[PDB]
């Protein structure tokens, strides 16, 4: 019951791969949910190099709606993976608790689930055992997909384990005998999750289990009058039993209902002595390789747009002056341009101190404020 700096407690839920338990940090009290896989039940290979490739592969998948994996702790008896913890529970428990939900919250959950499934598809991984019991909610009422790639072990063994182990959530292709299941299973399971969010009840649910498989093979499903016909047209286009007519990510993104309330951050792609001391090479001013009269016109335009009062003795010698808005006193400085070579020109700033007036505020910090607004306008 001790991994890293985390003691363990009770059991959060039951998983066919392994039991998921909660862990608590002994000092801070942070909660980390660790999935514990029994090696004696399922182990394809005992090579440590494949474990190293798994550690290299699974850690680099960061997404704001996919549950992040922290590390994979090896053990001669079990397999430990420390995932993050959420306090909202499973989606299916939320459906059983609250029944029917609003459409504006169901679309907000569905867009986040689709943005996680499309992220998994862009990283070439599918979640064949997808169901509302494998997606979670946080404290902020978002959606978190639990296991993105762990269903591959269920796919590796036999397809009969997929039908017998998960009789309710099973694709028509898998029960029809397709050995390899692709993203069409993800689209169908996301449609089942969307129907569960929109209606609360299951789309295909029979007491007799081969009758349930026959009803899954049947295209027809019950439609209530609560939902407007656009989203049930989307569900009919999305829940086709043949994968040629089943929708894609682009086919959902081109739909009218999906584009009503869409946050921009969901899709990453828009098209579909003791201490160390380090020296710094400081720069005096601005090295501009242009005509000096044009640089003087640029500085004049900048100090005109910054509302400064200025007078020139020489054309290159610019004494500017501004009155502060909140501070009653005024500050005085002087600009001068330098010729280091025939190509580039250096602009230099020189303040003059206040002679007799005990001015309020700080003279040198207001001198830095007379240039922190000027360098942003010049940007050179």
């Amino acid at each position: 019951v001790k991994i890293g700096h985390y003691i363990l407690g009770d059991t959060l839920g039951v998983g066919t791969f392994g039991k998921v338990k909660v862990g608590k940090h002994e000092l801070t009290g942070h909660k980390v949910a660790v999935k514990i896989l029994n090696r004696q039940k399922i182990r394809s290979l005992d090579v440590v190099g494949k474990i190293r490739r798994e550690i290299q592969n699974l850690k680099l998948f960061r997404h704001p709606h996919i549950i992040k994996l922290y590390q994979v702790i090896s053990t001669p008896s079990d397999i430990f993976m420390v995932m993050e913890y959420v306090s909202g529970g499973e989606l299916f428990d939320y459906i059983c608790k609250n029944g029917r939900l609003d459409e504006k919250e169901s679309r907000r959950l569905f867009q986040q689930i689709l943005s996680g499934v499309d992220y998994c598809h862009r990283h070439m991984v599918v979640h064949r055992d997808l169901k509302p019991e494998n997606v979670l909610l946080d404290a902020h009422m978002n959606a978190k997909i639990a296991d993105f790639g762990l269903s591959n072990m269920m796919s590796d063994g036999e397809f009969l384990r997929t039908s017998c182990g998960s009789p309710n959530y099973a694709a028509p292709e898998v029960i029809s005998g397709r050995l390899y299941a692709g993203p069409e299973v993800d689209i169908w399971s996301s449609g089942v999750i969307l129907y569960a969010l929109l209606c609360g009840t299951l789309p295909f649910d029979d007491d007799h289990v081969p009758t349930l498989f026959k009803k899954i093979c049947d295209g027809i499903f019950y439609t209530p009058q609560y939902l407007n016909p656009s989203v049930i047209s989307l569900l009919k286009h999305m829940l086709q039993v043949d994968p040629m007519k089943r929708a894609t990510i682009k086919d959902i993104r081109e739909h009218e209902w999906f584009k009503q309330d869409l946050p921009k951050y969901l899709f990453p792609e828009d098209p579909s002595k003791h201490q160390g001391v380090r020296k710094a090479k400081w720069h005096l001013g601005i090295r501009s390789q242009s005509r000096p009269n044009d640089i003087m016109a640029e500085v004049c335009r900048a100090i005109k747009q910054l509302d400064y009062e200025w007078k020139v003795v020489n054309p290159y010698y610019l004494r500017v002056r501004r009155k502060n808005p909140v501070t009653s006193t005024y500050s005085k400085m002087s600009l001068q341009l330098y010729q280091v070579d025939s190509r580039t020109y250096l602009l230099d700033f020189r303040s003059i101190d206040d002679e007799l007036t005990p001015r309020p505020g700080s003279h040198t910090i207001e001198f830095f404020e007379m240039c922190a607004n000027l360098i942003k306008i010049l940007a050179q």
Partner: antibody
Amino acid sequence: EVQLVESGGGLVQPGGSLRLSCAASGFNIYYYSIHWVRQAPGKGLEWVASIYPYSGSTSYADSVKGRFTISADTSKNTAYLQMNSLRAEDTAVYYCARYYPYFISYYSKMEAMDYWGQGTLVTVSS
Amino acid sequence: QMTQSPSSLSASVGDRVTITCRASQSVSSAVAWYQQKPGKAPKLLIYSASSLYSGVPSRFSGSRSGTDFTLTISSLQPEDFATYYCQQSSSGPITFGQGTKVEIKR
């Protein structure tokens, strides 16, 4: 129930444009990349074309670069290999094959070709 | 971008044969093997040169030794007389092998 039926083959005049299709029935063309290969009589396989509709990225061999434009229609699940300015060397049977780029296991990135078509025979002769 | 070069041999029924595939550059475990009967479609046997593709049973086996990919056929049935092809897809341009043919001993 996946069958890759080819069409548009036969005999062509050298210097003419040909467009053979691949009716992908049983799966969806938007996720998987349709790859064309060349099987000369007596020789082995030879990769010629590729199109991946999910990210919109294509691939080509070094010998047929910029001359055999590939096209994919996701509405009818077909793959159009529009060949242009063909030479006398390109005389073979053209197989159609889907491609599975996904992680089937946690450790093994599967990158093979699962399902193969019957292939039509094009003959180029003056 | 690279080339492949398998071997070529012939043996009897039930003999243990091997087919090498020397990769040119440094590649990963992304090498497949396609069995093509004469006048038929190339059937897939092993997809990543180490684990068996579902379908065809465990007679076909492959091992990985650096850049020398092997295909071992133990207990050769009298129906498995076809042409075998190496296939490298890790680089990005797909390059096939020269193709080895298995002839019966006479």
